[PDB]
Amino acid sequence: QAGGTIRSLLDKVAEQEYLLPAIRPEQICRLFDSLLQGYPFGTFLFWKIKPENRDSYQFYQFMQHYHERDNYHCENVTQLPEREFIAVLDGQQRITALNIGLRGSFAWKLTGKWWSNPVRRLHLNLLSKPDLSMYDFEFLTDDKASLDQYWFRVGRIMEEEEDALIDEVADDARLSSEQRKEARSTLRHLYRTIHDKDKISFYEESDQSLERVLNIFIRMNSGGTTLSYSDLLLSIAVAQWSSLDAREEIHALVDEMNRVGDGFNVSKDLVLKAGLMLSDIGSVGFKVENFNKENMAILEKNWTPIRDALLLSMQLLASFGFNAQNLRATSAILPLAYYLHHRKLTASYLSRVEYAVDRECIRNWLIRSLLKASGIWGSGLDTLLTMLRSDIKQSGDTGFPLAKIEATMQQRGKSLRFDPEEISELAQLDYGNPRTFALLTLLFPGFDFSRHFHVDHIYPKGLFTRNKLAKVGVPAEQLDELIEASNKLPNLQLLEGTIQKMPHEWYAQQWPDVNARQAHLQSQAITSLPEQLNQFMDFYRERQETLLARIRTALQP
Amino acid sequence: MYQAGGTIRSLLDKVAEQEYLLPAIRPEQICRLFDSLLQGYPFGTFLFWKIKPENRDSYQFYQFMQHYHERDNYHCENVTQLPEREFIAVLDGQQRITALNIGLRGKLTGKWWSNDDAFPVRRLHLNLLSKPDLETGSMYDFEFLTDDKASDASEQYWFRVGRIMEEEEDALIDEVADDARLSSEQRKEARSTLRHLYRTIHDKDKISFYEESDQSLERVLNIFIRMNSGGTTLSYSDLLLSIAVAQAREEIHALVDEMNRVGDGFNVSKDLVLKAGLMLSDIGSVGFKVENFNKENMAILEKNWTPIRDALLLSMQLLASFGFNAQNLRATSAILPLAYYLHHRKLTASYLSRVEYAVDRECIRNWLIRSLLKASGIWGSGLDTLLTMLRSDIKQSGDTGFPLAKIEATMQQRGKSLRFDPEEISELAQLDYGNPRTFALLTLLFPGFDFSRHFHVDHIYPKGLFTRNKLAKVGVPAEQLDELIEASNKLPNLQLLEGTINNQKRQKMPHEWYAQQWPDVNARQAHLQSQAITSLPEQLNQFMDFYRERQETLLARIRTALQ
Ligand SMILES: [Cl-]
């Protein structure tokens, strides 16, 4: 146990003496800042395998070079060490983070534009300046760090000797006198922390008594680790209620809400934030300051109406057929739940046709809010929720105020008016985008979303395989130029009911009536259906031009 | 602020001064911590919350526990005196400080009414002549003892760890020195130990903490979790040693969930499946240790996987055919022997319907119920060894069926006997509504019942009629009151009722519900005589006359059914 060095540990990892029994870049950079800032590491748990049990278990190596496509699974042990070896039971991620940073690489898929066709390594600015962080660490590509901020690869601390690196900086003339001075202090801090410092601590033990020492660690070190601000806040908040049955009631509603229809995944966090919003509390932040005794008193005095409304909220989203896979913005339920609370609406709201227009007004808003790439439900959300809540109080007594909510949102910069580019992106959306279902719900508003339904390909994806298209006679150049489009909105439609024929056959053995067939089709924006698969592209580009103009109109206010 | 420095005396002294508080609400466990403390094992970093007096009256803080009383103080007391200056609310380390506090600063019949003889005050003690117990792996002996059980074992000198905080070092080192009860050489050993304690509670920096304000709790919290435990440490997840060697995580979770949904419900753990793995795959060692989870052992397990998966499910269903649920089967470690029997004989759901297995299922149930009625450790200690021997018995007798004869005798040799002692019999007749053992006793004493169809335990005389005030209308001595209301929950007022909660009976008194729902004189007479009800008083005043008469009727059946 006692103490130890990061260099010592990283090297036993390399010699494969430190292993792993079975089992975010920016976050690795954050460990390294905290480390160089002197935030100490906690104690780690280690298991020493007797040489007799060397073959008894299947150990795996830590990750050094990460590639989401190439190496993403912890590689198995290559050469079983010839002597005593250790397997880590706690601190795996902490160790892996140091390994990737000082001896490895990280390749993550770049977020590209919607038109789509990189091994980076850890670097530190020696002329690091603080940011209200203290030390700027970034995973960068070599050419992006050669930028004419003096960037240094932290990895060389493990490959070169201090004297060489200290000297390179001093012999660099791109740097002025005062600069080289700062750079040296910083480079030294790094070398003198990865090397020459007692940061690692480790409870170690053998097979027989491993049972006892894991439990000592759990008593002495933490048990039931804080789920961040979240379980803390819940803990803090529940501790200001008369009912010592409060903790449960929240978890209970969360469960009921997540079994409303086909299924949802809200968090206790949403319930707490909703509580604040519905209680007309002036701040809606998820902060312990806002979960005081006075604030939580209001919630406890109004819990039953608030719970009911949030449940009806999910019931309404499922009336519009949302589930855990298509609704990604749980933050959008909050305005809706304030509305059902302001008007004290009940389950009857979903049935009475008298409220049908208002339900379709809400859906218009929700869909358009979720169709925006991003910017509506992310940053600045707390100011928005506040101003949206306000709108509902001043003019919701009549009905949902879309006119006002639309412009309040424009003012906070979060307009729901789509640009020609945002519209062009929406017309090439892929099958998997959660935004796809909802675009179709808007474009095709007549459906019983309240009942089972799904999204399918007019021309089935099965036929879209390189051989099959070529058997029919598609230029080899156009192969794989169609298979990609087979999964794009112009070949996507909304169908009634749960989940082998070309569309024009299914549509003539299921739509015998010429007049009714022509209608279902024009209603699904299917203007024509060509019989040779080698004419699908003329179809695709035709439906798109039709849908593009239908998307513009449907998002015009 | 990261105070790496800090002593236990300082913490506890700030705890007593009500400056260290809590925002939100077992002895042996506390005792294990104290041994490890003196074994040098350090504490983890704690997280503390600074409260400026501008927000002092806004969050309802609570004190740590010191003198615990299941009946009186079982919840952290509210703040008696709020401090005027800045103060702290612990977020991490809540339990660890609450073990030091109670440690250095403070029954079985569960006759809840009795204040006396029913809540003995025990305080932490240490044997200064402690010695290595290579079984527990302990090197220091800490037990919670009462003053009498603390005062002449030749090698046990008990020191109340509490005086360390009230007396002076010199004084205690002197008391041990001027104690003629001790022997010269053994006086030296005591001193060395007493010193380590005084010098660990004081004079040694063991407490470490992060004191943070509201402004930046979010950030430093996150920083703490990065550098410290974020994966909530771990568990004895030997399941990993197998998803690895075997070529699974899903299958286990599946058996667990399916087994937990068989009847009205069960709450089994992944642990049982794995333990049954070794039990049913004939591995000579059933320990949940990592040693038996070897590549070659886990080879037999995946071959017997389909065979065991079924038996564990068949086991759970047999239990639900006996009315068992999460609420009434706390000792889930008793399923393991049952599963071996089903696997040995390769039975199926047809064991649950075919009348040819009735005598057999009833032999099993009797044993199971009897095993659970004992409040001692038939399924608490020496399990790996009992289970190992039961396996042998079941394997050598899987013909006529359950070797109950042999199983009882092997349990008797291992001291896990099921012959009931007269005193233990008497407490079974006084079992409360809550003790899960009660459900079973009723099913053992009333073996003719539809355990199959939905059923609930109810009270002959309804619980709602027993309110201090309600009994004054009928006129009862207020002398025996908080005890009469307790008897409303004991066995003589408890019965097995078919169906579910009948709100229509809670209102009526027994002679007003049986009298109508059972109109035939001959039928009622029997439904009742079968539920051990000889007479049913109609004046609530005579309840205690009914209780004693039934207790005598039930005591009779208990002695007949056991023994
Ligand atoms: Cl914000």
Automatic annotation (TrEMBL), chain A:
Superkingdom of origin: Bacteria
The entry's keywords: Plasmid
Domain called GmrSD restriction endonucleases N-terminal: residue spans: 7-235
InterPro entries: GmrSD_N (IPR004919)
Pfam annotation, one family: GmrSD_N
Record PANTHER family: DUF262 DOMAIN-CONTAINING PROTEIN, VNG6097C
Record-given protein name: GmrSD restriction endonucleases N-terminal domain-containing protein
From TrEMBL, chain B:
Pfam family, one: GmrSD_N
InterPro entries from the UniProt entry: GmrSD_N (IPR004919)
Ranges where the GmrSD restriction endonucleases N-terminal domain occurs: 9-242
Keywords annotated in UniProt: Plasmid
Entries under PANTHER family matching the protein: DUF262 DOMAIN-CONTAINING PROTEIN, VNG6097C
Name recorded for this polypeptide: GmrSD restriction endonucleases N-terminal domain-containing protein
Species of the source: Escherichia fergusonii (strain ATCC 35469 / DSM 13698 / CCUG 18766 / IAM 14443 / JCM 21226 / LMG 7866 / NBRC 102419 / NCTC 12128 / CDC 0568-73)
Species classification: Bacteria, Pseudomonadati, Pseudomonadota, Gammaproteobacteria, Enterobacterales
